[PDB]
Amino acid sequence: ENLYFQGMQRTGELPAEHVPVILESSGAGDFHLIDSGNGLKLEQYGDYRVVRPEAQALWRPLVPDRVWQNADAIFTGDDGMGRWRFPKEALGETWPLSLLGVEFLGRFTAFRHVGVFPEQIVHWEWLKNAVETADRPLKVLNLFGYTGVASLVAAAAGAEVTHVDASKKAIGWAKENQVLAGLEQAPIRWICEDAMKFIQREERRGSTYDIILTDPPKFGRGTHGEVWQLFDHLPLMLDICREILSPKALGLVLTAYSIRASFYSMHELMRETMRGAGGVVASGELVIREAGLDGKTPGRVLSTSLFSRWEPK
Amino acid sequence: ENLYFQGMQRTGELPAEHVPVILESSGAGDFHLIDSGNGLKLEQYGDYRVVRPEAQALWRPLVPDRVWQNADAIFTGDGMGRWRFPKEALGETWPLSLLGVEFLGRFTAFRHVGVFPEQIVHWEWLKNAVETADRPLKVLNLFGYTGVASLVAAAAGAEVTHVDASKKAIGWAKENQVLAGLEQAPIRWICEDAMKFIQREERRGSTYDIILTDPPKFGRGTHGEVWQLFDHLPLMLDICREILSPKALGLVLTAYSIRASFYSMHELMRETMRGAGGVVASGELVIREAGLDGKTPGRVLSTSLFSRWEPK
Amino acid sequence: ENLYFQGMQRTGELPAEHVPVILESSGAGDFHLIDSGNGLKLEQYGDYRVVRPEAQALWRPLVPDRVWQNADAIFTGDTGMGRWRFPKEALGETWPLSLLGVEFLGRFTAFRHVGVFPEQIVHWEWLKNAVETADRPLKVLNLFGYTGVASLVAAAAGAEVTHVDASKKAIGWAKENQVLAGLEQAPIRWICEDAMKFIQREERRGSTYDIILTDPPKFGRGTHGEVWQLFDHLPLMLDICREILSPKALGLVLTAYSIRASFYSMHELMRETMRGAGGVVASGELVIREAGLDGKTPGRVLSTSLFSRWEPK
Ligand SMILES: C[S@+](CC[C@H](N)C(=O)[O-])C[C@H]1O[C@@H](n2cnc3c(N)ncnc32)[C@H](O)[C@@H]1O
Ligand SMILES: C[S@+](CC[C@H](N)C(=O)[O-])C[C@H]1O[C@@H](n2cnc3c(N)ncnc32)[C@H](O)[C@@H]1O
Ligand SMILES: C[S@@+](CC[C@H](N)C(=O)[O-])C[C@H]1O[C@@H](n2cnc3c(N)ncnc32)[C@H](O)[C@@H]1O
User: Fold this and answer.
1) Could you name the CATH architecture of B1-27+92-312?
2) Atom 3 of ligand 2, residue of closest alpha carbon
3) What CATH homologous superfamily does A28-92 map to?
4) What CA dihedral angle connects A108, A112, A116 and A117, to 10 degrees?
5) A-chain residues within 8 Å CB-CB of C201?
6) Facing residue for C90 by CB, picked from B4, B200, B225
């Protein structure tokens, strides 16, 4: 029961809604899902073919064994930490990739992650369009920014970006992507801090942003050990986000992975957060479709994450 | 069963005893307990009113919910958590003063705010012991934490050795030293397992006039040494005795996590001090609620055990 | 079940086998096992008499209580971090030792381990002989090298040594031993890396070694958090080791403290790994025999570890 992190009461009427909205990613170029099944997925990231666990890929693989057995890297093991197997000669920590004009690194760590969630291109497209068509310089806030591809998309489009992540290591990775992308001179502020602390302090300062993106994990830790738990804390976070939106704000975008909840729960939370603000809240799932070996052969849907987006419409 | 951490054999009579002794504080300073109940407590720390869990505060709160809700900071979660700041975001630290010593309250990911204000009773004993001493005194403060006792002793003119296994905690204590204006005071900062340090002091023939020790139920030395109060305390107290000066003024043991009785601490202390004369006083250290006005005595909240040997 | 870490299929005949081979050390010079029983052991390491837990010492102690009660240090256990008791007086962190001509430090940490496995002298003797009777300087690889006494034995004998350990702290200890042993100028290359990642990279580089020693724990962690689990990963490890043996290799030596397995399981793994390579695989247990107080007095066997050794013999 939420005692201390409740959203504040707002006046006015709930915004309009579009729900469910299923967003489906196209590859993308350097990424496609080749095949999946038996609790695994087979993905192409540029020159690297990778096998990773995907528990919900319950069905049987449709692409021949020979294609799976030609993978460059296979993630194995059971905390979250495991071991990559490299069955041929592909090796080192990193490899270059590009999505939506932004060059960044795929990276093998002890975790199953590869340094990008390429399905998020659908949201980066929304972001890029919003920045490049705005007739004024925009401020974009990116919370839980990870390897920073959204930050770089926004920076490349002309935004003044503030990227927030509690992990100094992840900030380092994002900065490496910034160099690779040729965006060293772009206005990106790198904030290594707990995300909710940063925004509450921004609220106290009276700071505002035109677009806020937020990608909270189910569980996290702030830079000074502050426990983050999505189901305990999200209502306060979104409330503070609204308090730091500019009068002419273009959007508030929430993405959520790996969570025992429907998009309807993100949706109704977002609708209530934005009570009296007008506009429209669109929510649902973000999915990838299998594309086969050639990348042109549509197959099954693999749902990755939830989203809810407010816009002034 | 304790096989390897037994105290040495002693001769003579057990010291005199005063037991139970209940030591009480009510916060006539930058601290008081406002209210408690339903497994929580409402406290004033200087400019901030804070709400923290207190599982043994089983009774019902006497101050209206509206007041608790109005707190500046609430500690939440299941040991790490998250502080909620309902009015507006608060900075990490805020200045406090107790017994003439200025130090920092601190919001960390834990429930601890950087001070145990009830310990002012033991600080007052210490302050008096040092002040009224004819001679310069050597004070050892084991498991010293944020070091308010170290600063009290330094301010009274003692030569202080502060021992804590945590470099982070030493850092906080040093920050307090600076804020308190005690940078030129003789405080030696030792980052080491406490029992290792005192056994090495014994080997060196070092002595101290006053020893305070605040061991946790479980801890870890600077180099991973496992500390467990019920396995190791008998040996620690025995070594403490071995490093007391001939004219020592006291040995003070404080113990949180109040599962064992003060009687156990008491019988162990008394036996450790066999043949040393003086008196062992033991019991609990408690805070009494003071209400919104700080002047309305309420319920007792017991925080810790203590046992103190003095030549008294 | 092993899906991703199988050794390649080999053709040809399994090497000859000698099994069980029980290797026994009675402790010379600075080490011997005085007595053991009641789940404890009483050992002399140079000038210190030490008591440590030894759960399999189920029998009774045969040396009087007085002698045990005169110990300089006793390890007392939460299980495996604990606390050393020094009953006579506080002991410093380290003390000088020497075995097989190599000077190194005994060390009190929060674990039961004193900085050397002196029973390993039997394998060090095999190694010393192999290096010092060779007609060329041998390349010796030592995986999971710990405090590096084997590395120092090989280097003293004239080998070019590569020492691999994921722990920077352990590498630091080994280097301290190198200094103490007077081997600072010797060709020892200190590698702080996951052992399997290092050897796969060696394989890619086409590198070879004349002798390979590997002492994998049941469970470990690479420098960059890679999970090591002997039962999941050892088959691939040994196969890569084979691929980095020189044509004129003198041996591949596996040691394992995972006592629960039989030496037969290390044996058959090593035999199959070396299929078609000729030579001989000898496997069994490495044991210490109690030496008692005075005279060299043969007592009970304390088995410490498993081993399997391939040689071209
Ligand atoms: C942890 S999530 C990982 C990706 C995706 N959102 C998911 O849940 O799988 C994205 C980023 O959030 C960061 N993070 C976790 N807790 C945080 C916190 N309390 N404040 C700021 N960033 C945090 C992580 O360091 C990471 O780079
Ligand atoms: C951990 S206790 C916490 C306060 C109070 N004594 C309690 O138990 O709740 C006080 C200090 O003991 C220190 N400490 C814990 N184990 C220690 C050890 N083995 N040696 C020296 N200091 C230790 C901690 O770093 C901390 O600052
Ligand atoms: C095997 S462990 C301890 C000694 C003995 N083998 C045992 O299991 O009890 C020996 C060394 O392996 C190292 N180690 C553990 N995991 C490793 C890894 N993944 N790669 C390289 N070294 C590792 C440790 O740092 C340690 O110094």
Assistant:
1) 3-Layer(aba) Sandwich (3.40)
2) B216
3) Golgi alpha-mannosidase II (2.60.40.1180)
4) 160
5) 91
6) B200
Give the position, in ligand 2's atom list, of the atom nearest the Cα of B164: 22
Residues enclosing ligand 2, CB less than 6 A?
Answer: B 143, 145, 163-166, 169, 193-194, 214, 216, 219-221, 225, 227, 256
Tell me the DSSP string of chain C.
--SS-PPPP--SPPPEEEEEEEEEE---TTEEEEEEETTEEEEEETTEEEEEE-TT--S---S-HHHHHT-SEEEEE----EEEE-SSSPPPSEEEEEETTEEEEEE--SSS--S--GGGHHHHHHHHHHHHHSSSPPEEEEET-TT-HHHHHHHHTT-EEEEE-S-HHHHHHHHHHHHHHT-TTS-EEEE-S-HHHHHHHHHHHT--BSEEEE---SEEE-TT--EEEHHHHHHHHHHHHHHTB-TT--EEEEEE--TTS-HHHHHHHHHHHTTTS-SEEEEEEEEEE---SSS-----EEEEEEEEEEE--
- Could you tell me which of B226, B114, B209 has the C-alpha nearest to residue B165? B226
Q: Cβ of B108 and A222 within 8 Å? A: no
Residue C165 CA: nearest ligand 3 atom is 22
Question: Alpha-carbon Rg of chain A, whole angstroms?
Answer: 20
Please report which ligand is nearest the Cα atom of C151: 3
CB A52 within 8 Å of CB A84: no
Question: Whats the size of chain C, residue-wise?
Answer: 313
Which residues of C fall within a CB distance of 8 Å from B203? Answer: 89-90
CATH class for the region spanning B28-91:
mainly beta
| C contacts of B235 (beta carbons < 8 Å) | 85
Closest Cα in chain B to A228: B82
First-to-last alpha carbon distance for chain B, in angstroms, is: 34
Domain boundaries, chain C: 1-27+93-313, 28-92
Separation between Cα atoms, residue B43 and residue B31, nearest integer Å: 7
Residue C48 CB–ligand 3 contact under 6 Å: no
Q: For ligand 3, is residue C146 a contact (CB within 6 Å)? A: yes
- The number of helices, as runs of H, and strands, as runs of E, in chain B is 7, 17
- Interchain CB distance below 8 Å, A227 and B80: yes
- Indicate the SS3 state at residue A167: coil
Cα–Cα separations (whole angstroms), residue C159 to A82, C121, C134, C141, C240: 35, 17, 10, 10, 22
CATH number (1.20.58.220, 3.30.70.330, 3.40.50.150, 3.40.50.300) of A1-27+93-313 reads 3.40.50.150
- Classify strands A73-76 and A48-53 as parallel, antiparallel or unpaired: parallel
- For ligand 3, pick from C142, C146, C171, C266 the residue to mutate: most ligand atoms within 8 Å of CB: C146
| d(C-alpha B213, C-alpha B305), whole Å | 12
Q: How far is the CA of A145 from the centre of ligand 1 (A)?
A: 7
